[PDB]
């Protein structure tokens, strides 16, 4: 009898622990593997896939398709703000239900570079330009285009090619950021300003629409798995 001493932590059941256990059905025979297209080895390969962003949450439109559409209309003056939303991919209502939004909510910490892909769905003849700005925190969301200039902005132009890519770089004083809302690490702001008013021929429709996309670059990473507040329950399902 090899002498031995139990240590604190015996006869406990830990949720995340790693241990070996005796099999309940010895020498069971396993069916062979098959080659199934689309094998995921890691969740990060989901986080790089594009997804639509319900940029317009206003009012009761969240029950219709119009939640995904951004109105763009010819004005009589330039410098009006197209839209804007805060960057809090796990908290802010914008990204909340997105694809990237779901995967984050399981994780507490993250860092990387979020790409925003925009695509102009308007009429083929109408053209236009736009100013996509990103203002790091330290001041409120800029309320005038002249103020949006001093951020990091990509002047983007409609034309033969359609899609655009605004790559939000990674600027923070820490390595990671809370996915849950906190004022300490708060992310920043994003705006879109008319660079030059939409020009439309005659007989072509005045108003257009612009859809937004979200993806994570190849430097993206997450940490510290947790529960997701979204899904509810009452009593066991039947």
């Amino acid at each position: 009898g090899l002498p031995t001493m139990n240590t604190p932590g015996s006869c406990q059941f830990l949720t995340s622990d790693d241990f070996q256990s005796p099999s309940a059905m010895p020498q069971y025979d396993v069916t062979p593997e098959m080659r199934i297209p689309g094998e995921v080895k890691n969740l990060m390969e989901i986080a790089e896939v594009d997804s639509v962003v319900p940029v317009q949450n206003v009012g009761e439109k969240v029950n219709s398709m119009e939640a995904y559409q951004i109105p763009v209309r010819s004005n009589e003056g330039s410098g009006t703000q197209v839209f804007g939303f805060p960057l809090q991919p796990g908290y802010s209502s914008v990204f909340s239900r997105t694809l990237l939004g779901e995967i984050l909510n399981y994780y507490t910490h993250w860092s990387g570079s979020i790409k925003l892909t925009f695509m102009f769905c308007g009429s083929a003849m109408a053209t236009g330009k736009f100013l996509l700005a990103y203002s790091p925190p330290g001041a409120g969301a800029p309320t005038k285009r002249v103020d949006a200039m001093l951020g990091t902005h990509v002047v983007w132009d409609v034309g033969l090619q359609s899609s655009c890519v605004l790559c939000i770089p990674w600027i923070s004083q820490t390595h990671y950021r809370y996915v849950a809302s906190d004022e300490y690490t708060a992310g920043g702001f994003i705006t879109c300003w008319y660079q030059t008013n939409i020009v439309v021929p005659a007989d072509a429709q005045s108003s257009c629409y612009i859809m937004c996309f979200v993806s994570a670059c190849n430097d993206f990473s997450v940490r510290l798995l947790k529960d997701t507040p979204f899904i509810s329950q009452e009593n066991f399902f039947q």
Partner: protein, 56 residues
């Protein structure tokens, strides 16, 4: 018939042994990192180049 591997650090070895006769009794494999995004991003037949326009 032991085996040796590396822990998870940031800035070592551990000795593991399988005690049972059934594969399903072995401990979980946490360390497989292999990743190939090409099966979701870039699912096109004609390979596209970043530095060039998409539709030419």
């Amino acid at each position: 018939g032991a085996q040796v591997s590396t822990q998870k650090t940031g800035a070592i070895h551990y000795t593991n042994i399988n005690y049972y006769k059934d594969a399903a009794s072995n401990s979980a494999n946490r360390q497989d990192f292999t990743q190939d995004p090409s099966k979701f991003t870039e699912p096109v037949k004609d390979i596209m180049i970043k530095s060039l326009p998409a539709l030419n």
